[PDB]
Design a protein around this ligand. Structure first.
Ligand SMILES: [Zn+2]
Ligand SMILES: [Zn+2]
Lengths: 46, 48, 67, 49, 98, 48
RNA sequence: AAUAACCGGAGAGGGAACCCACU
């Protein structure tokens, strides 16, 4: 259920649940990115 | 349609070669401009 | 952003030439001579390796914000 | 040389390298069409943009 | 390449090009703009001659093999935004799958 | 069709809601066009 | 000793000003 986000400056993986402060568990950074999808992807070389 | 199809073969272009003339005509240009320039200079002197 | 692996007009493989070309230029050769040594005879292939700009070093200079 | 027939071009041509810049006015950002879509509130006319 | 850190910078309507190339023929002044480091546009062997009659006025006939090999293939960006808002209990905006 | 004393007005006409529509933004519904505000001021002053 | 219940039952919501850019 909870999603996997990435700190940025730490580069560290962290978990966050909805309606929660957006802080890294150890440095408490505020910028938060989201990880790539698990769904497949396929491009024709064209 | 037809004239474009013939242009396909004949070819119509434009290039730096078409923008250049011969040295004798260039010399004529220089002579003409020099004569006119010195004449206008003389006119300026007369006015002065 | 990287060397184009092929000549836009011909198709000659050019991507592999880049590191060797930098080696030659560091080897104190005039770019024309070094290029001819690398074997680019037409000017529709010479242009790419002569006047290509490498930004990938600039992009690598930064940190990976995604890890 | 013509590439369809193969015959040589009658008149020589000017050629050579130069520099081009493709502009920001891509076509995909201009083409659109309407078929009885929405309407403004104040007046019963098609939207804009 | 409008600025080096375009990947991280999240602008709106940002265009960037696969293969910038410093122009073959230029002034001396260009390199003082760093325009050699962030060039825009690609050289192109052109031929000034009406070929097929498909390029009458301000038109050009492009080799398609170049387009397929990387001639001017550009990428285009766009960034959105959204401010979830909490209000005085008459309205409360939250992020959730509807 | 016209009379001199009709030029002086004693009753203010007011149009239907079409002339002054009401709009909802973000579900607020607070967005009200200037016609409603002007009419509100008019009626307030008239009552006073 | 009980019988097809619309079975892709779809209209949309601001606007107003300013600046930029294309003809
Ligand atoms: Zn952190
Ligand atoms: Zn080539």
């Amino acid at each position: 259920q909870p999603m996997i986000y990435i700190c940025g400056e730490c580069h560290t993986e962290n978990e966050i649940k909805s309606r929660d402060p957006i802080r890294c568990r150890e440095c408490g950074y505020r910028i938060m990115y989201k990880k790539r999808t698990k769904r497949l992807v396929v491009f024709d070389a064209r | 349609t037809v004239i474009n199809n013939w242009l396909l073969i004949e070819g119509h272009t434009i290039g730096i070669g078409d923008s250049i003339a011969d040295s004798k005509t260039y010399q004529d240009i220089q002579n003409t401009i020099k004569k006119a320039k010195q004449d206008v200079i003389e006119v300026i002197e007369k006015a002065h | 952003m990287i060397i184009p692996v092929r000549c836009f007009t011909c198709g000659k493989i050019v991507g592999n030439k880049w590191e060797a070309y930098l080696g030659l230029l560091q080897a104190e050769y005039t770019e024309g001579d070094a290029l001819d040594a690398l074997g680019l005879k037409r000017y529709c292939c010479r242009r790419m390796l002569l006047a290509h700009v490498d930004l990938i070093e600039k992009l690598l200079n930064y940190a990976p914000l995604e890890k | 040389y013509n590439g369809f027939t193969g015959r040589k071009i009658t008149s020589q041509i000017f050629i050579g390298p130069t520099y081009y810049q493709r502009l920001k006015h891509m076509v995909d950002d201009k083409i659109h069409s309407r078929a009885r879509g929405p309407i403004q509130i104040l007046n019963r006319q098609p939207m804009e943009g | 390449v409008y600025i080096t850190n375009f990947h991280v910078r999240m602008d709106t309507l940002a265009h960037v090009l696969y293969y910038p190339q410093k122009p073959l023929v230029t002034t001396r002044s260009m390199e003082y703009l760093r325009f050699r480091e962030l060039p825009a546009g690609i050289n192109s062997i052109v031929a000034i001659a009406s070929y097929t009659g498909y390029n009458q006025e301000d038109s050009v006939i492009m080799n398609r093999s170049a387009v397929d090999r990387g001639f001017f293939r550009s990428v285009f960006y766009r960034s959105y935004k959204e401010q979830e808002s909490k209000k005085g209990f008459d309205q409360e905006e939250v992020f959730e799958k509807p | 069709y016209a009379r001199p004393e009709w030029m002086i007005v004693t009753v203010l006409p007011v149009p239907p809601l079409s002339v002054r529509p009401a709009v909802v933004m973000q579900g607020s519904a607070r967005n009200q066009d200037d016609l409603t505000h002007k009419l509100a001021d008019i009626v307030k002053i008239n009552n006073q």
